[PDB]
């Protein structure tokens, strides 16, 4: 093995914007990596393809992965409704860090966020599992469609996604 | 992120003295920073403007923020009457440090202090959230109107305050 | 201390259905009873008048009190965005029990539930604070519009509310 890489082709109201790719740190958090990889390829029959980023806060992060209700209340893991925080080995070191959204301890589902800054205050309460490899400039362009309270002003979607290697 | 900057325009017995400005460490304690920022702009309909520094102790600190009772017993946060200790990442490293006053754990309101000395004995029990950028000379002038017990010899007021950046 | 009593006048797609009244156990959880009383009078500028029951599950409970988002994601208390679990003195003893919804420890806001059975699996994790006095029949009627998943076949409304004594 190497650490796996996934891609998101991002669209804005259906117009393609670009690709973001991610290293998933399966050498630190194999279970959390695998969940995201699997949901990215679609191979369990559900996943991120077609889903939207429902909450984007410029200067902070882009939040997505809610493929069942597209508003933050939804999604599911390949392990069931929720799974445990695997460990907190990795920290929120800076822009591009990919980390799990949750609703408290041991509530990992499918939602994730992509950081557009060092978010240190989240260390120890969100499992960090990957980092943006190429396409930070695309995450930066996605930002511009966000707002302070998170509402997006255009529909930002994962038009396709899957694994590169 | 870019850390916000707020300013206070300090008056002594109604006479404008000058400007103090502060960096807020939104990148370490965003919720604490945001409270001070918004109380400083006035944007929720209440806040620091017109309030006084009720307790000044030479060699220690200047304490204010008590915009409802003007004596240490009052104030409220933008989040409700009180909020939790966000974290203790930042320490009380020297003069200029901005930190929350409290009444024990998890009782952050609107009250704060501006250190005029390193105050290491408060680390771990006051959330530090900013630092003087400019106008430390104003804080030193303020400090002279305090006393061992904190009673002030002139009314030290925040005539106006707000966000620069 | 005599315990206060509030009323809900319930409506189904706007068709008046009837009055439910509630004893609030201010003698056990005064802070939690007061939140609900004030929301019920609307005296603080906001409250339950006009809100709906967004999740109703026959044989379990009716959940309402989300007056900002009407889906379980919203509501606020009179003490701010959230407040602490006051105590767990009272248990979920049977139908009619009024208890608080939450998103885990110390996340009480405006959401509540009216039990329709004994729900003892919740003792300790939801602050019980009141109980149906008159109108249990009106709740058993509301119960009929829910479903195993909680979605309601009609808009169950609090057309009016306030305090009797």
């Amino acid at each position: 093995m190497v650490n796996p890489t996934v891609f998101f082709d991002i669209a804005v109201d259906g117009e393609p914007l670009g690709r973001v790719s991610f290293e998933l740190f399966a050498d630190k958090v194999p279970k959390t990596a695998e969940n995201f990889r699997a949901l990215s390829t679609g191979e369990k029959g559900f996943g991120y393809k077609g889903s939207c980023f429902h909450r984007i806060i410029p200067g902070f992060m882009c939040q997505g992965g809610d493929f069942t209700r597209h508003n933050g209340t939804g999604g599911k893991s390949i392990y069931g409704e929720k799974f445990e925080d695997e460990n907190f080995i990795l920290k929120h070191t800076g822009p591009g860090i990919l980390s799990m959204a949750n609703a408290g301890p041991n509530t990992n589902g499918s939602q994730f966020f992509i950081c557009t800054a060092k978010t240190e205050w989240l260390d120890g309460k969100h499992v960090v599992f990957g980092k943006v490899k190429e396409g930070m400039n695309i995450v930066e362009a996605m930002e511009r469609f966000g707002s302070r309270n998170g509402k997006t002003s255009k529909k930002i979607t994962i038009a396709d996604c899957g694994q590169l290697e | 992120m870019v850390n916000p900057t707020v300013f206070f325009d300090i008056a002594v017995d109604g006479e404008p003295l000058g400007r103090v400005s502060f960096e807020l460490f939104a990148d370490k304690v965003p919720k604490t920073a945001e409270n001070f920022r918004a109380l400083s702009t006035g944007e929720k309909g209440f806040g620091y403007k017109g309030s006084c520094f009720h307790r000044i102790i030479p060699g220690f600190m200047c304490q204010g923020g008590d915009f409802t009772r003007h004596n240490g017993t009052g104030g409220k946060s933008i989040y409700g009457e009180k909020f939790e200790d966000e974290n203790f990442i930042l320490k009380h490293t020297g003069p200029g440090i901005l930190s929350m006053a409290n009444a024990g754990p998890n009782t952050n309101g609107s009250q704060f202090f501006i250190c005029t000395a390193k105050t290491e004995w408060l680390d771990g029990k006051h959330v530090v959230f900013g630092k003087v950028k400019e106008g430390m000379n104003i804080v030193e002038a303020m400090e002279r109107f305090g006393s061992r017990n904190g009673k002030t010899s002139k009314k030290i007021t925040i005539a106006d305050c707000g966000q620069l950046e | 201390m005599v315990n206060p009593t509030v009323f809900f006048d319930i409506a189904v797609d706007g068709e008046p259905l009837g009055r439910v009244s509630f004893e609030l156990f201010a003698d056990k959880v005064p802070k939690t009873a007061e939140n609900f009383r004030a929301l019920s009078t609307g005296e603080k500028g906001f409250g339950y008048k006009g809100s709906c029951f967004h999740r109703i599950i026959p044989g379990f409970m009716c959940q309402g009190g989300d007056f900002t988002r009407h889906n379980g994601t919203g509501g606020k208390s009179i003490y701010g965005e959230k407040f602490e679990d006051e105590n767990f003195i009272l248990k979920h003893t049977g139908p009619g029990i009024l208890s608080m919804a939450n998103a885990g420890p110390n996340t009480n806001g405006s959401q509540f539930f009216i039990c329709t059975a004994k729900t003892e699996w919740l003792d300790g994790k939801h602050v019980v604070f009141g109980k149906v006095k008159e109108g249990m029949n009106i709740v058993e009627a509301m119960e009929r519009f829910g479903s195993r998943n909680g979605k309601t076949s009609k808009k169950i409304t609090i057309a009016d509310c306030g305090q009797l004594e």
Binding site: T73, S99, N102, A103, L122 | - | -
Partner: peptide, 11 residues
Amino acid sequence: XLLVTAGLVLA
């Protein structure tokens, strides 16, 4: 504030 939750978004 600036949290990343799923359901109850807090300040």
